[PDB]
Design a protein around this ligand. Structure first.
Ligand code: FMN
Ligand code: FMN
Lengths: 172, 175
């Protein structure tokens, strides 16, 4: 039996090039819903979200603040992920929570047959980007941007074998 | 209603009570495989894992360094998650990657009809706990422990409405 959840986890790829087809509001809502249901340490739910569509002037602003402008410009929708500092309890664990949210969103995108890619280089420019977007970096920590669209490529990656990542070999 | 991946994301719960049923090596392997396939910056793959079964004396060590000893002693398997400090490129982003790995493992456990819970309070004791497990805190950052077993309870939780979590309303009809 090939479990669809396990299959999705294994087959989800960073997709960085999209077709010209529209991404529906309903798809975006479903992806966002996946994000909000990720866990958080105290059920503090520190993540906040901002949707930026291709036709939005803010797409150019985002592109201007990352080396991956071509991906940003090719995407149909970009979901920006932040932590509300007033909802945080622990820096390390709230960043882990943001990762869990992003992962849920990437899996949901894949499950909807959309392609997406986690963009983290862009967060290096948070200090100039947030003000450019009229957002307050004193209140918000910028965690990630997810670029998405209908896929125009299959994606390709690799991982080292499980046995190398285990600190001790647990099987007989 | 129709999508199993979306259902899993929504229905996955922190399960803290388990039956006495064994968790197979194959289940543990499938969970770990889900973990290593989470994304990481640069595909650096900074996460490292240590499996501790219930019958392992190291469970007693784990239990002595957490206020959640009932969960620790009741679990059939615990997966310790770490970042390899040599493989890190950015602490925030690598913590996020550890979160994505943990989340994949929790979804994988759920998909396998297992109950699991992300334990993070335990990492507060890393400085004393790691050396007790013969691990080097100069080499590894302790990110989380996942306690797991066949479920002896359904969990329950709540989330704020999406509308309260958006910085802006993206749909024509406000949320
Ligand atoms: C924290 C983080 C930041 C990332 N930043 C970028 C980035 O800015 N640009 C990019 O193209 N991919 C980025 N990625 C995607 C990774 O390169 C990708 O996950 C990795 O190469 C493995 O490929 P896969 O996602 O297909 O499994 C990032 C991934 C993570 C988890
Ligand atoms: C960073 C992190 C640390 C956590 N630590 C603990 C913990 O030590 N003990 C515990 O019982 N649950 C812990 N949890 C589980 C949360 O309490 C749980 O995810 C949250 O209450 C929402 O419940 P749900 O997982 O059923 O959706 C942790 C979750 C996260 C994301």
């Amino acid at each position: 039996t090939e479990n669809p959840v396990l299959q999705a986890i294994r087959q989800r790829r960073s997709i960085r090039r999209y077709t010209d087809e529209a991404v529906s509001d309903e798809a975006v809502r479903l992806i966002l819903e996946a994000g909000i249901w990720a866990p958080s340490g105290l059920n503090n739910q520190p993540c906040r979200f901002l949707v930026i569509r291709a036709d939005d002037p803010r797409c150019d602003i985002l592109a201007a603040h990352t080396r991956y402008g071509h991906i940003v410009r090719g995407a149909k929708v970009i979901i920006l992920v932040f932590l509300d500092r007033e909802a945080m309890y622990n820096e390390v664990k709230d960043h882990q929570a943001a990762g869990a949210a992003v992962q849920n969103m990437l899996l949901a995108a894949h499950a909807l047959q959309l392609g997406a890619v986690w963009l983290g280089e862009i967060i290096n420019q948070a200090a100039t980007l947030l003000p450019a977007l009229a957002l307050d970096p004193a209140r918000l920590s910028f965690e990630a941007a997810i670029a998405a669209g209908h896929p125009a490529q299959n994606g390709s990656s690799s991982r080292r074998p499980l046995a190398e990542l285990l600190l001790e070999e647990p099987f007989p």
